Structure formats: C-alpha cells, structure tokens
C-alpha cells in the first residue's frame, strides 16, 4: 500500500472490483478464479525479461532460466494431455488460432467448422474476424430436434464441399463431443482436422471429456476457463513437422515476445490441475451444472437447449418469458447475477436480439458451491426472470444471493 | 507460503532475480518495472473477462473494470495528447496487425524503413505477417552519414505510390522527423503510420518529437523507454479511423482483454505523468551519449552515424577483427548483456551480423549516472580489445561487479 498511496484511484477501482467479484455470482461459463500463487507469477520479475524464439534457441542472451520456466511449462502441458509437442506463447486463444490456421491452410481455403449460432467461435468464421475474412468456411448445424451435432451431416458436408480443414470445438455447446468421429470424416475427404479445446480444456485435463490431441492434428485452447489457469493460448500436436510450422507461424509469424510472467503462471497452473484435487474440482463442476439443468428444465418459460448438459455450461431460451437475452441480462444484474446473453441453434445471428443466454458453473463450483447450493442458484434465475414487474421478489432474490455470497467467501 | 506447493517453479524465478542483480543489462529494449506495475499485473483483474469497449461491453458486470480500462485510455490521451486511444493490444505486434487492417488492404504497397537499417520484423519481413500479406518496399539510410536522407524518402514515395508510408525503427540511434514525413505522404495522397514503440518513452517525456499530430495512426507498446507492463497500444486523432481501429482488435484479431495488464498499463501512464519521469529521460539520454563519446575515442569501436539522439547506439566492431554475434560472447562471459545488430549497408549475414545494439533505459533505471555509463563503457571495449586474454576478462569482470553491488535492483 506504500506503492499505492501514490495511485489512489487505480488501486480503489481494484478494491472495488474485487469487493464486486465478493458481492456477485460469477455465472459467465468462460469465467473462474486463479490461485494466488497464479496471480503471483504473473505479478512477477519475469515481466522485465525479453525471449524472442524458443528454449535454446533464444535471439538474446540470459534466458537460461526463462527458459527453466517456459520449458517447466511446456513439460508440464505434455504431461497433462499426452501430446508430443507444446507451443505456450500464443498471447490468448485468438492468437493460437490464428498461428493454427496458417500452419494447416493457405489464404482462401475452405474449412468447415460449427455454425456460429449453435455453438462456434467468433474465431470459426464470422465475417467481422480475421477467419471469415481470410479464409472460405462453411458450417454444420445442429439437429432441429435434438439440437446435437449430427455427424451424417458433418460427413455430407464434408464430401460435398471438400474442405481442407474441418474445426471442431465451440464456446456455446454443452454436449460431448466425439473428436474421433471428427478424423474418421477428416480422413475419408481427405482433410486436416483442428480442434478448439478452450472451454473444456479444465474437463479433458481430469478425464472428464474425450481428449481431442490424439486426433487432432492441432489443438488449441486458452489457459484460462476450466483450467483455471491465466489468461492466454497455448497450441499441442503430435506431429513433429507441424510443430516446427507452429513455432514459426507464432514467432516470428504472428507475434513478437512471449509474456514469460504469464507463462510462469501457466506452469503453475499446470501443476495444480496435474493435482487429484482438481480432477475433485472438475467432477463438481459437471455435478453443478446438472443439478441446475434439472431445475431449468422443470421451470415455466426456460427452455434448456438439447435439453441436458455433458460439461460445465447450458444455453437457456427466454422467449417464453416475453423477454430477450439482453433484457435477461439485465434483470439478474440488478440482483447480483452475472450472465451472458448468448445466440441459440437456428437463430439468424443477431447479437442484440437474440432470445438465448449462458449459464456455467467453473466459477462458483471454485468458490466451494455444491449441487445443493447450485439448485439454489438456479431457483434464484427463474425467480428473479419471472419477477415481471415486482420490486419485492427481485429483493427476495438479492437476500438468497446474500446469503450464498457469505457462505461461500473468495478471499 | 503457497511457493511450497511447486518448489520447482519459484526456485527458477530467484536464479532470474539474481541473475538480473548481477547483470549489466545493455539490451535497447529492455527495463525494469515498478512494484506497483507488477502488483497490478498479478491482481484479480485477470479474473474478469471484458470482451468489447467501456459502455458497450458484451458481458455484465464491467463497472469498475470499465474504470481501470478508461483510467489507462484517458492517461494515455493525457500523456501524448491523443483524441482516441486503444489499449487493448497484447503486444505491439499485435497493434501494429491492428493498424494495417484499419489502413490498407491485402497486398496494398507500403513504404517503411530498411530490416536491415533500423526497421522492425512487423516492418515487412517475409518470415512476418507483414512481409506475407502486404507489398514492402524499403527505405533505408545515407551511406556517408549513416541517418535518414528524406529527399531520399521523397525520391521512393514518389517511384512506388505507396498506400502506407511507415515511420520508427528499432536501431536507429537518431531523431525521426515525424513532420517531414506527413509533408512526403501528403505529396504523394498516402497515409502515414508511426511506430514509436522504442522511444515512446522518450516521446511522452518531451523529448523527441511527438508523432501524433502527424500520423494517421500511432502505434506503440507500453514496455521498453515507457517502463510499462508488456503489451501494445494504439493512438489516433481521427474519429472514423479510431471505430475501424476499435474494430480491428476486437472482433478483428483479439478476442478479451488481458485487463489486469492494461490496470499496469494505468499504473505506468500516472508514473510518466509524474515529473520525475522526465528527468528519469534525460538521464537515459544522457547516459547514452557519455558512452557513445568513449566509443568513439577507443580504437576498434565505431558508433554508427557517429552520434545518438536518444536511448541507443550501434556500435561497428570489425576493426577489431570482430563479429557481432562474437563480440556478443565476449562480453557475455563478463556479465554483459548486449545483442548482435546489422549495420547499414551490412557486408556479412544476419547470423554473424557486424556490431552490437547497446542501450541505456535498463542501467538508468538502476540508477546509473553518466559517471558510472562511462565505466560501463570502458569496461566494454577493455573486453572487445583483451584478445582472449582471460587476465582482463577478470578484471571487467570484477569491474562489472562492482557496479551492480553499487546499484542494486531487487
């Protein structure tokens, strides 16, 4: 606080924030809290040290113990998902997917990848990204019934458009996913296959889902989200000569100097999740976000996209309830709920009006919630959601919020 | 306390924490942070995702979040007397992928200083994204003076007809006339783009021209002569430029914010707003030209161009019958930490290279005065001129270690 007299203002919007983050139910799937010694690495000497290249062949000189860390980090990704190779540079998941697709396709390729309403990544081809601009994507859906991915489809697609690279993955879709169905498609038209791990990567990690690296020719992912880890990308392979196109698409490719202060917390986070606590954590996880689906489902006017949950997340349908996702948002704000309003299977993406939001359960479930305590929660989303026009429910609702915050402290 | 958890981990950031005590860092891009730069770096922030821009944000919950981030963009807008800023870039690599896609298309011809004179890797190289998806074409330096020839920047701009015109260099020891190159690019109806990264530090401080009002977008990053957190930033005075900027990043080629980095970023910007980083500058400079005085005056070193205008120096070591990449070993085996650098007009490859990169913002953090540069710099050419002769490495050796027992770090 000697440092911080010299700040008041900065250091009382972090006192604020972190009084808010206290005060709040985090439900954002993408959200989490880092450990302290995570937040200590990153907060680290490390910051002041540039290492432009890799572990030995470094362009400055003095990285001999950078590059203990970065390969402390490295070792430690292989470990944890079995893959061959690791690149731990990428400044966040977009930035390892952009290096991803120029190790694997040339400007205007066609890849085919979810569609971006029923589950995929901005980064998959939205024409306001890099991707849509640069390369020639097509999508798969879900089924209109089910709201699954139907891998009939993905193979007619396939065959019918002969892409050079198939993505799998998404950021909005809370059912399994069946990587090695995904290179069996990839094989027969002939085609690369890239998956996009960043949201479940924390579950693969525990065993919890199909691990996508012994199929993919890449994976990507971010370190934060289920892994709990900070902020940033990281890319795996198995294939030798992809890891080379990989280091270089990254450095000099894409990027200049790695933030080695973060990848100090990457190997930090690594380690923990390598932990028989954290596959504990990410059993709880699933177990929250089931109980939670039981209580949506049961509820008058929130519909459960597919109906059920395999991981950390559900996407929930509001039209019933004569709201949107924006309106939605900004009702369980105002009793100390954090959500995203999110696009749903089938809507023309409209990212204002769309009738969907996104509910997850990494953040709580660290916080020390159980399935009991998630059932709470859910219970107050539908209180406050129905409480059209009625000042004494959402107060009810801010006093069983309350009371779950103090049960369950931060820090 | 939770370092018992992974031994490993923390036992290699104290061997780096020793080894910059007792290292004479002369890396020109190098520095060293404030406590409270790191403080912000490891707070909760990075907890929060904050996808989109203050008022406009995707997700809820961004009230104080949006505070930290406009506390950076208006200290920003402040300090170089910028109408717009943008402050969420990772690096600036990526401002500098920002500020393209917002100024020209695919394949569009552009007109930046020479690789091998001075120009950054995001300046055209063709193992870069910017030599891949635009048409570089070079300007470079006088082969007498060793500095820019702008009637030579005239004669090209004119030959291409460029859509671009970049200004800012990474070794380039002397003053970048900002205003004479808005008067080339407005000649020949093209836009201008500078990168001030190396000397943005010097720039806030009012000491080397500030290129702001003149170039269609500023880029920069926030480490380096600004003694921020790593990360990039993006600066303009046009409106419709500053939405195509905002755009670029986000949904263009980032996707959230590393918030708890721009919290440091605000914490760096206050610090340079404060008087005391001005004269924290000058002493950068003037350290720089008391070294560059003893290498002109010692036999086998050359200062290319003969002079410096702010924080750095490339330093001609071939007369002593010398590589940059072997007199980088030399004076690495001394505890001397500099990186071999290609000379205009350079003979040999980049591998080998001909003279070194030698900067001062690291050393003047840690308190040096011109004083103890001199000694720095004495100590250097008694290392290049000891012909592997291990009695005078020693004795560098434990002049270089007198000098860090003097100023110390950590």
């Known amino acids: ?31 989490n809290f880092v450990s302290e010694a995570v937040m200590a690495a990153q907060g680290s000497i490390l910051t002041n040290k540039y290492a432009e290249g890799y572990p030995g062949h470094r362009y400055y000189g003095g990285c001999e113990f950078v590059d203990i860390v970065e390969n402390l980090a490295i070792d430690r990704a292989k470990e944890l998902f079995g893959a061959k190779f690791a690149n731990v540079q990428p400044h966040s998941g977009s930035q390892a997917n952009t290096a991803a697709y120029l190790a694997l396709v040339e400007p205007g390729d066609t890849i085919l990848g979810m569609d971006l309403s029923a589950g995929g990544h901005l980064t998959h081809g939205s024409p306001v990204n890099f991707s849509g601009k640069t390369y020639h994507f097509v999508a798969y859906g879900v089924d209109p019934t089910t709201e699954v991915i139907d891998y009939n489809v993905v193979r007619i697609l396939a065959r019918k458009h002969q892409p050079k690279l198939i993505v799998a ?48 020719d890449i994976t990507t992912t971010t370190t934060h989200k289920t892994l709990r880890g900070p902020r940033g990308g990281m890319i795996l392979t198995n294939d030798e000569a992809l890891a080379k196109k990989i280091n270089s698409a990254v450095f000099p490719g894409i990027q200049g100097g ?93 990212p204002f009006k ?20 998630a059932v709470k929660v859910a219970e107050l989303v539908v209180k406050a959601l129905q409480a059209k026009d009625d000042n004494a429910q959402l107060d009810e609702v801010k006093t069983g919020v309350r009371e ?5 402290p931060l820090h």
């Open 354 to 373: 769309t009738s969907g939001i996104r509910i997850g359960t990494p953040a709580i479930t660290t916080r020390g919630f159980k399935e009991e305590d």
């Open 404 to 408: 779950l915050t103090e049960k369950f």
């Open 169 to 216: 993955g998404a950021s909005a879709y809370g059912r399994t996913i069946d990587f090695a169905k995904f290179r069996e498609i990839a094989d027969e038209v002939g085609a690369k296959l890239m998956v996009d791990m960043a949201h479940i990567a924390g579950l693969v990690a525990a065993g919890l889902h199909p691990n996508p690296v012994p199929y993919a």
């Open 258 to 350: 790695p933030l080695e202060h973060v990848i100090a917390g990457k190997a930090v986070a690594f380690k923990e999740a390598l932990d028989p606590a954290f596959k504990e954590y990410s059993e709880q996880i699933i177990a929250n976000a089931k109980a939670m689906v039981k209580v949506f489902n049961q509820a008058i006017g929130t519909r459960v996209i597919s109906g059920a949950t395999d991981n950390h997340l559900m996407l929930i349908d509001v039209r019933e309830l004569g709201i949107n996702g924006k309106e939605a948002e900004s009702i369980l704000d105002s009793v100390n709920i954090t959500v995203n309003k999110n696009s749903i299977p089938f809507e023309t993406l409209s």
């Open 1 to 31: 606080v000697d440092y911080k007299t010299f700040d008041p203002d900065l250091w009382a919007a972090i006192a604020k924030e972190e009084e808010r983050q206290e005060h709040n139910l985090e439900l954002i799937a993408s959200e």
